[PDB]
């Protein structure tokens, strides 16, 4: 119940010329970091997928599919376009008990291989933040992973708060 403080938004770059149409589709979480994320070598974090779908109103339908307790859970929420392109807020925030704020900032992406996305939420008055290294495939170059590690560290996170989920085939394919 001690959190590393969220960084100031100045330390989180924004992906320039964000193309919402090109960001659509399935992304694999090849890297995950955050002040509430901890490496667990006893029971390692399994890889999951997050699928982005533009609706007519240009807001995203965001579905995360995860393999947990031998079934696939489906975490659904809406990302509403924020102050500038590549920046979002959470739609229908009142339906999530405790949530007072939620921010999404796409830091960098080339749209067809990889992406880094910054998340910040204030839940039960506690300020959580996270970065995900998204991949179009389950594997990415060690270079991109090291860059993700360097970015996470630049935001105050030590490497025991930086995990690389293990590739799986259940649920996240198809
Ligand atoms: O399942 C995920 N989480 C938890 C959510 O519980 C929480 O600790 C408080 N959460 C929010 O109130 C929240 C609200 C809206 C959006 C969110 O992201 C929230 O976390 C869960 O459902 O088990 C999840 C999966 C994939 C990716 C994620 O980022 C997840 O959180
Ligand atoms: N189900 C998967 C793990 O199998 C999962 O929820 O991990 C993703 C991660 N973002 C997360 O939700 O874990 C920590 C959790 N959430 C965050 O730290 C978090 C932080 C910033 C933005 C978010 O949407 C978050 O969910 C928490 O508050 O304890
Ligand atoms: Fe979450």
UniProtKB/Swiss-Prot annotation:
Q: What is its main location?
A: secreted
Task: Report the subcellular localization.
Answer: Secreted; Cytoplasmic granule lumen; Cytoplasmic vesicle lumen
Q: Name one GO cellular component term.
A: specific granule lumen
**Tissues where this protein is expressed:** Detected in neutrophils (at protein level). Expressed in bone marrow and in tissues that are prone to exposure to microorganism. High expression is found in bone marrow as well as in uterus, prostate, salivary gland, stomach, appendix, colon, trachea and lung. Expressed in the medullary tubules of the kidney. Not found in the small intestine or peripheral blood leukocytes.
Keywords attached to this Swiss-Prot or TrEMBL record, sorted alphabetically, are: Apoptosis, Cytoplasmic vesicle, Disulfide bond, Glycoprotein, Immunity, Innate immunity, Ion transport, Iron, Iron transport, Pyrrolidone carboxylic acid, Secreted, Signal, Transport
The entry marks the following residues as binding a carboxymycobactin, namely 48-50, 121, 130, 134
PROSITE patterns noted in UniProt:
LIPOCALIN
KW Signal (keyword) present = yes
Sugar attachment sites are: 61
- Which GO biological process annotations does it have? acute-phase response; cellular response to amyloid-beta; cellular response to hydrogen peroxide; cellular response to hypoxia; cellular response to increased oxygen levels; cellular response to interleukin-1; cellular response to interleukin-6; cellular response to lipopolysaccharide
Question: Which Gene3D superfamilies does the UniProt record give?
Answer: 2.40.128.20
InterPro entries for the chain: Calycin, LCN2/LCN12, Lipocalin, Lipocalin_CS, Lipocln_cytosolic_FA-bd_dom
GO molecular function annotation: enterobactin binding; identical protein binding; iron ion binding; iron ion sequestering activity; protease binding
- Name what induces it: Expression is activated by the oncoprotein BCR-ABL; BCR-ABL misregulates expression via the JAK/STAT pathway and binding of STAT5A to the promoter. Induced by insulin.
Keyword Methyltransferase attributed: no
The record lists enterobactin as bound by 102, 130
Cystine links in this protein are 72-171
What family is reported? Belongs to the calycin superfamily. Lipocalin family.
User: Tell me, what does this protein do in biology?
Assistant: Iron-trafficking protein involved in multiple processes such as apoptosis, innate immunity and renal development. Binds iron through association with 2,3-dihydroxybenzoic acid (2,3-DHBA), a siderophore that shares structural similarities with bacterial enterobactin, and delivers or removes iron from the cell, depending on the context. Iron-bound form (holo-24p3) is internalized following binding to the SLC22A17 (24p3R) receptor, leading to release of iron and subsequent increase of intracellular iron concentration.
Quaternary context:
Monomer. Homodimer; disulfide-linked. Heterodimer; disulfide-linked with MMP9.
For this entry, the protein name equals Neutrophil gelatinase-associated lipocalin
- Give the originating organism: Homo sapiens
Lineage start: Eukaryota, Metazoa, Chordata, Craniata, Vertebrata
Gene symbol here is LCN2
């Amino acid at each position: 119940s001690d959190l590393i403080p969220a960084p100031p938004l100045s330390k989180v770059p924004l992906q320039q010329n964000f193309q919402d149409n090109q960001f659509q589709g399935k992304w694999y979480v090849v890297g995950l970091a955050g002040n509430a994320i901890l490496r667990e070598d006893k029971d390692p974090q399994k890889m999951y997928a997050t699928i982005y779908e533009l609706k007519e109103d240009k807001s995203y339908n965001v579905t995360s599919v995860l393999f947990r307790k031998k079934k696939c859970d489906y975490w659904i929420r809406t990302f509403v376009p924020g102050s500038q392109p590549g920046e979002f807020t959470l739609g229908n925030i009142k339906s999530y008990p405790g949530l007072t704020s939620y921010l999404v900032r796409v830091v960098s992406t080339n749209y067809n291989q990889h992406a880094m996305v910054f998340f910040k939420k204030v839940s039960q008055n506690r300020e959580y933040f996270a970065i995900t290294l998204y991949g179009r495939t389950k594997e990415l170059t060690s270079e991109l992973k090291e860059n993700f590690i360097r970015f996470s560290k630049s935001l105050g996170l030590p490497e025991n708060h930086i995990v690389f989920p293990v590739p799986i085939d259940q649920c996240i394919d198809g």
